RNA sequence: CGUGAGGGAAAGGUGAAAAGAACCCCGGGAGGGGAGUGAAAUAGAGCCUGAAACCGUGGGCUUACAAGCAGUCACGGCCCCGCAGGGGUUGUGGCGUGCCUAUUGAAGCAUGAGCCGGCGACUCACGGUCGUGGGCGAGCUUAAGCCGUUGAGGCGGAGGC
RNA sequence: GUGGAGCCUGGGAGUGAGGGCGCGAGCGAUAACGUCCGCGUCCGAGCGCGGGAACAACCGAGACCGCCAGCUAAGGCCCCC
RNA sequence: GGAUGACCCCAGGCGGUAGGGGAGCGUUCCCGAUGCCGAUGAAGGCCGACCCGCGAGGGCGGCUGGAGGUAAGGGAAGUGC
């Protein structure tokens, strides 16, 4: 090995063209059927505590 | 009207935290509320503060009502950077820049 | 007394840069990369003016030819008729005629046809 | 007084039969109908020629020992990947090709001389499914 | 104030060759061809200085704006006096005055005024003449000036 | 109804009522001139061999001026050589009254 | 920083006046939003002015069959300013081998340069030799000093050519 | 033969690595984008421009600026052109 | 030409590295200044598709700025990246 290294500074064009994917992609939420708050699905509702429509987590 | 909150000199990297903001720049107040809450970034907390707070101001200081609110614009400019010295092999010291961010959330009301 | 730099520099740089808006990358943003692009532009200009004369000629003559085809002779004779006869209408004009004055052109073809 | 540049034009279709036609000498003509150089309001930078339809391409004529002694070529980028097809074999598998190639190398290169070659619709066989444009038969 | 010391070794550092930081090409270091204190004075030929003094007055007269005076009436070292003398003299100071006499009294009232340049007579000089608009000399002043051009 | 005129080594087609600024002519503003005809067409159709001998076109000198600066500049490389020249061509804008003929 | 002798930094400016922002609201705070001071608060203490590189938000043109020292010339489209005129952008075509340096010869696969800003290299004295603008002319000229003035010039013939 | 000819006297230089080409010779092998002289030329400094596919020196030709005018040079006139 | 570079007519020259000669632009400072511009806005900064100059430039206008700047003509240099 002989320490490989960038040959030219990368332009803003390429630099930013690379990041063309870093696009963050929002969480996925659904209505708790009970508190109707938004929360991620298949989790136990952090706000009311119910899941499959029963008390599970003493909030 | 337009309501504005601005947190400046915040010790997170701009480039990392823009990515929380682009996820709201647009949304309702309520949508931005529920995004920045399940978004899994550090930026989540920081930006959900500014937001939350600009929606004070709108109500309290600017006679606006919540459920007309939406994140009209929201950008992040780059604050001056804590320069730090991290030591490498054979005694070279390289410089870390613990970078810094000026977060901005700007609210408006949506008629509809 | 000290005649320090002070303002001159910022002002030629501000100059050459403004001469160079529109350019790609630092060809529009860096002074010395703008300055360098502008050396280019310069001679591409001076050349291309001298080029554009001959450029158009080529355009016209190609039309002119295309016209003389439509009346059964080549450009290169049609311009010997026009010659030896006596007509001295240049080809910006012949090209103009032949496009938007077909009959008026046809005349000349004919007098050239003849002058042979 | 400024040169005349055309406004928008109309696509004039044109029909040619090859047969007994010396391939090269034909394509010359195909190319300049294709470009447009046969009409006074010509302009180098715009698509404004005719819409050449050639039929009976399979019965084109070529001179000399060329049916064999002249060769098409096709690098593929892999090693040894140079294919070599000779004229005869070409005419016998896809003859509509022989003429296309003949022309493409007389059209200019770049997005136009390509956009032009898009218009030359060639066929080996007499009939051509371009009836709904009424190709104005031409004598080459 | 710097040390004569080579700041890193000649070859192999990777940086450019340097001597010591005293060098002009470093911020800090001495300036190159600096101003150093000197003497702009020179010995203009004696004749040329005379003809200067001749010509200068000679011009002021030739314009009418010269004026020889015998002595100064109501003026014993007290501005407003001179001021009022000058009034009867034909100069209200809408033009500048070069004023010559060995007479501390006269040129003392005659100091402080904008339009007045004071002089003693042995100190007549050609800048001061041209410098002003109107020369109002005086008679012994005139003979010292005449004792000069000889 | 139109003509083709040689004026300062350069032939323009000229209908009457046209603005045609051309290579600066010596003519105090307001005066009028005549430009040889080389060809007349539409309605009639004469052809000058080389001139029409007869007619001509008359037009008024609306005034003079200098053309929008072209910036001519030469550069040669590795030889330390540049040149800036400013250029404004003198012209004389005309008003085509009518043709003769 | 060096055991030491020794080396040796960076870093000035709110405003006229602290009148340095009570109190209120989001905030754990930092910060900010009203409010309040000021001529001015994008003079708010990270404080005059506030360039350029560099990072961002918004807008107009443009871009996913295209081959490039990134420009230039020409034509057309859309956008703005306008009322045969401009400005912006770029679709197509034509043309086109970066700057500097060093060399017989470099786009050169020969040197240097990430980019910006700011420092950065033909001088001074005495002496020569030409030229030059002036002064005097078989002559021209003072040096050190003495006197005078404190931005006044005079004297001094030793001496020099 | 009035020419950015020449001669005279002074001021300031730079240059004292040249290269290709044609021709005449030495050296080399009737080799070298080889070497060394001579006579010319061009590049150097005309990597400005047309030709030669491209390309310092081969052919055409010595670029003060502008023109959407004209004749030509070499070289070209079947399409790219 | 005419009359002492006023400006017109005519003919001609005007590629250029080392290098020589010329004519100019701008920066700091000095005399011009006890003056003159300037809070009805100095210098500086940011625009401009306008004006003058071949050009280096210099004008003019808008925003910014918030206390300086400085002419005609001359002088002197820590004078242009
Ligand atoms: Mg290993
Ligand atoms: Mg980008
Ligand atoms: Mg609220
Ligand atoms: Mg260690
Ligand atoms: Mg780094
Ligand atoms: Mg100073
Ligand atoms: Mg300097
Ligand atoms: Mg800009
Ligand atoms: Mg562009
Ligand atoms: Mg050219
Ligand atoms: Mg030509
Ligand atoms: Mg002719
Ligand atoms: Mg055969
Ligand atoms: Mg010391
Ligand atoms: Mg020390
Ligand atoms: Mg020392
Ligand atoms: Mg030592
Ligand atoms: Mg080193
Ligand atoms: Mg290195
Ligand atoms: Mg040394
Ligand atoms: Mg230092
Ligand atoms: Mg110092
Ligand atoms: Mg001296
Ligand atoms: Mg006084
Ligand atoms: Mg005083
Ligand atoms: Mg005075
Ligand atoms: Mg013109
Ligand atoms: Mg130009
Ligand atoms: Mg080059
Ligand atoms: Mg060279
Ligand atoms: Mg150069
Ligand atoms: Mg010039
Ligand atoms: Mg220690
Ligand atoms: Mg210690
Ligand atoms: Mg204080
Ligand atoms: Mg706590
Ligand atoms: Mg607070
Ligand atoms: Mg806030
Ligand atoms: Mg506050
Ligand atoms: Mg401001
Ligand atoms: Mg301020
Ligand atoms: Mg700061
Ligand atoms: Mg201040
Ligand atoms: Mg500030
Ligand atoms: Mg700032
Ligand atoms: Mg954007
Ligand atoms: Mg599109
Ligand atoms: Mg394709
Ligand atoms: Mg497409
Ligand atoms: Mg190619
Ligand atoms: Mg355009
Ligand atoms: Mg193009
Ligand atoms: Mg072209
Ligand atoms: Mg290219
Ligand atoms: Mg270069
Ligand atoms: Mg350069
Ligand atoms: Mg070297
Ligand atoms: Mg070499
Ligand atoms: Mg070498
Ligand atoms: Mg050389
Ligand atoms: Mg390279
Ligand atoms: Mg070397
Ligand atoms: Mg290199
Ligand atoms: Mg170098
Ligand atoms: Mg580095
Ligand atoms: Mg710099
Ligand atoms: Mg010297
Ligand atoms: Mg000195
Ligand atoms: Mg001397
Ligand atoms: Mg005598
Ligand atoms: Mg004497
Ligand atoms: Mg000569
Ligand atoms: Mg000579
Ligand atoms: Mg000689
Ligand atoms: Mg010299
Ligand atoms: Mg030698
Ligand atoms: Mg030799
Ligand atoms: Mg030799
Ligand atoms: Mg020679
Ligand atoms: Mg030779
Ligand atoms: Mg050789
Ligand atoms: Mg040989
Ligand atoms: Mg030989
Ligand atoms: Mg050259
Ligand atoms: Mg030569
Ligand atoms: Mg050549
Ligand atoms: Mg080359
Ligand atoms: Mg060539
Ligand atoms: Mg060529
Ligand atoms: Mg011809
Ligand atoms: Mg020939
Ligand atoms: Mg001339
Ligand atoms: Mg010439
Ligand atoms: Mg020259
Ligand atoms: Mg100053
Ligand atoms: Mg003063
Ligand atoms: Mg003052
Ligand atoms: Mg006033
Ligand atoms: Mg005020
Ligand atoms: Mg203002
Ligand atoms: Mg200003
Ligand atoms: Mg003051
Ligand atoms: Mg001043
Ligand atoms: Mg001056
Ligand atoms: Mg210096
Ligand atoms: Zn719930």
Curated annotation (Swiss-Prot), chain A:
The keyword Lipoprotein does not apply. Residues 1-22 have a biased composition (Basic residues). InterPro entries: Ribosomal_bL32 (IPR002677), Ribosomal_bL32_bact (IPR044957), Ribosomal_zn-bd (IPR011332). Keywords: Ribonucleoprotein, Ribosomal protein. It holds the Pfam family Ribosomal_L32p. One of its GO terms (biological process) is translation. Residues 1-29 are annotated as: Disordered. GO terms for molecular function: structural constituent of ribosome. GO terms for cellular component: large ribosomal subunit. Coiled coil: none annotated. The keyword Ribosomal protein applies. NCBIfam families: rpmF_bact. Belongs to the bacterial ribosomal protein bL32 family. Part of the 50S ribosomal subunit. Found on the solvent side of the large subunit. This is Large ribosomal subunit protein bL32. It comes from Thermus thermophilus (strain ATCC 27634 / DSM 579 / HB8). The lineage of its organism: Bacteria, Thermotogati, Deinococcota, Deinococci, Thermales.
Curated annotation (Swiss-Prot), chain B:
One of its GO terms (molecular function) is structural constituent of ribosome. Keywords: Ribonucleoprotein, Ribosomal protein, RNA-binding, rRNA-binding. One of its GO terms (cellular component) is cytosolic large ribosomal subunit. GO terms for biological process: translation. InterPro entries: Ribosomal_uL22, Ribosomal_uL22_bac/chlpt-type, Ribosomal_uL22_bac/org-type, Ribosomal_uL22_CS, Ribosomal_uL22_sf. The keyword Transferase does not apply. Gene3D superfamilies: Ribosomal protein L22/L17 (3.90.470.10). The keyword Calcium does not apply. Part of the 50S ribosomal subunit. This protein binds specifically to 23S rRNA; its binding is stimulated by other ribosomal proteins, e.g. L4, L17, and L20. It is important during the early stages of 50S assembly. It makes multiple contacts with different domains of the 23S rRNA in the assembled 50S subunit and ribosome. PANTHER family: CHLOROPLAST 50S RIBOSOMAL PROTEIN L22-RELATED (PTHR13501), LARGE RIBOSOMAL SUBUNIT PROTEIN UL22M (PTHR13501:SF8). Belongs to the universal ribosomal protein uL22 family. NCBIfam families: rplV_bact. This is Large ribosomal subunit protein uL22.
From Swiss-Prot, chain E:
One of its GO terms (cellular component) is ribonucleoprotein complex. The keyword rRNA-binding applies. The keyword Glycosyltransferase does not apply. GO terms for molecular function: rRNA binding; structural constituent of ribosome. It comes from the Bacteria. One of its GO terms (biological process) is translation. Keywords: Ribonucleoprotein, Ribosomal protein, RNA-binding, rRNA-binding. Coiled coil: none annotated. The N-terminus is blocked. Part of the 50S ribosomal subunit. Belongs to the universal ribosomal protein uL4 family. One of the primary rRNA binding proteins, this protein initially binds near the 5'-end of the 23S rRNA. It is important during the early stages of 50S assembly. It makes multiple contacts with different domains of the 23S rRNA in the assembled 50S subunit and ribosome. Forms part of the polypeptide exit tunnel. This is Large ribosomal subunit protein uL4. The lineage of its organism: Bacteria, Thermotogati, Deinococcota, Deinococci, Thermales.
UniProtKB/Swiss-Prot annotation, chain F:
Disulfide bonds: none annotated. It holds the Pfam family Ribosomal_L21p. InterPro entries: bL21-like, bL21-like_sf, Ribosomal_bL21. Signal peptide: none annotated. It comes from the Bacteria. GO terms for cellular component: cytoplasm; ribonucleoprotein complex; ribosome. GO terms for molecular function: rRNA binding; structural constituent of ribosome. GO terms for biological process: translation. Keywords: Ribonucleoprotein, Ribosomal protein, RNA-binding, rRNA-binding. Contacts protein L20. Part of the 50S ribosomal subunit. This protein binds to 23S rRNA in the presence of protein L20. Found on the solvent side of the large subunit. Belongs to the bacterial ribosomal protein bL21 family. PANTHER family: 50S RIBOSOMAL PROTEIN L21 (PTHR21349), LARGE RIBOSOMAL SUBUNIT PROTEIN BL21M (PTHR21349:SF0). This is Large ribosomal subunit protein bL21. It comes from Thermus thermophilus (strain ATCC 27634 / DSM 579 / HB8).
């Amino acid at each position: 090995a002989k320490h490989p290294v960038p040959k030219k500074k990368t332009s803003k064009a390429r630099r930013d063209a690379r990041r063309s994917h870093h696009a963050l992609t929002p969480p996925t939420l659904v209505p708790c059927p009970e508190c109707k708050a938004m929360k991620p699905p298949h989790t136990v509702c952090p706000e009311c505590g119910y899941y499959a429509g029963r008390k599970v987590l003493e909030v | 009207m337009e309501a504005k909150a601005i947190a400046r000199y915040v010790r997170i990297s701009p480039r990392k935290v823009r990515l929380v903001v682009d996820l709201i720049r647009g949304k309702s107040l309520e949508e931005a509320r529920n995004i920045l809450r399940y978004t899994n970034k550090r930026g989540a907390y920081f930006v959900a503060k500014v937001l939350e707070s600009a929606a004070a101001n709108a109500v309290n200081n600017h006679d606006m009502l919540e459920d007309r609110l939406y994140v009209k614009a929201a950008y992040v400019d780059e604050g001056p950077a804590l320069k730090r010295v991290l030591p490498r092999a054979r005694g070279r010291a390289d410089i870390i820049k613990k970078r810094t961010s000026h977060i901005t959330v700007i609210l408006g009301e949506k008629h509809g | 007394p000290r005649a320090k730099t002070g303002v001159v520099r910022r002002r030629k740089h501000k100059k050459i840069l403004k001469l160079a808006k529109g350019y790609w990358g630092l060809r529009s943003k860096s002074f010395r990369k703008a300055r360098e692009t502008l050396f280019a532009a310069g001679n591409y200009a001076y050349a291309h003016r001298k080029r554009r004369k001959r450029d158009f000629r080529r355009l016209w003559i190609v039309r002119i030819n295309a016209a003389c085809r439509q009346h059964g002779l080549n450009y290169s004779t049609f311009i010997h008729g026009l010659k030896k006869a006596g007509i001295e209408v240049d080809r910006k004009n012949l090209a103009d005629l032949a496009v938007r004055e077909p009959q008026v052109f046809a005349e000349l073809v004919e007098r050239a046809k003849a002058a042979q | 007084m400024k040169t005349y540049v055309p406004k928008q034009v109309e696509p004039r279709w044109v029909l040619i039969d090859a047969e007994g036609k010396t391939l090269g000498r034909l394509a010359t003509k195909i190319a300049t109908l294709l470009r447009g150089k046969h009409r006074p309001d010509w302009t180098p930078n715009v698509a404004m020629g005719d819409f050449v339809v050639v039929v009976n391409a399979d019965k084109i004529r070529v001179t000399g020992k060329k049916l064999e002694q002249k060769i098409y070529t096709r690098y593929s980028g892999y090693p040894g990947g140079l294919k070599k097809i000779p004229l005869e074999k070409m005419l016998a598998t896809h003859p509509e090709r022989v003429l296309e190639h003949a022309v493409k190398g007389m059209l200019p290169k770049g997005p136009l001389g390509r956009r032009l070659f898009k218009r030359l619709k060639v066929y080996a066989g007499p009939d051509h499914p371009h009836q709904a444009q009424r190709p104005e038969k031409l004598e080459v | 104030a710097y040390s004569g010391r080579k700041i890193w070794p000649q070859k192999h550092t990777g940086r450019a060759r340097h001597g010591d930081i005293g060098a002009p090409i470093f911020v800090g270091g001495g300036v190159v061809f600096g101003p150093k204190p000197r003497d702009y004075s020179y010995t203009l030929p004696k004749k040329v200085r005379k003809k200067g003094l001749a010509m200068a007055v000679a011009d002021r007269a030739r314009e009418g704006k010269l004026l020889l005076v015998e002595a100064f009436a109501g003026v014993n070292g007290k501005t407003k006096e001179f001021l009022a003398w000058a009034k009867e003299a034909g100069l209200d100071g809408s033009e500048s005055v070069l004023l010559v006499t060995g007479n501390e009294l006269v040129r003392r009232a005659a100091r402080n005024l904008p339009w007045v340049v004071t002089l003693a007579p042995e100190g007549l000089n050609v800048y001061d003449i041209v410098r002003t608009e109107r020369l109002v000399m005086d008679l012994d002043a005139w003979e010292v000036f005449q004792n000069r051009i000889g | 109804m139109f003509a083709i005129v040689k004026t300062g080594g350069k032939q323009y087609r000229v209908e009457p009522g046209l603005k045609l600024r051309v290579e600066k002519l010596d003519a105090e503003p307001g005066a009028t001139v005549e430009l040889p005809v080389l060809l007349l067409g539409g309605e009639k159709t004469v052809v000058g061999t080389p001139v029409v001998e007869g007619a001509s076109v008359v037009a008024e000198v609306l005034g003079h001026g200098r053309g929008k600066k072209i910036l001519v500049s030469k550069f040669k490389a590795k030889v330390q050589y540049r040149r800036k020249k400013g250029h404004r061509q003198p012209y004389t804008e005309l008003l085509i009254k009518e043709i003769r003929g």
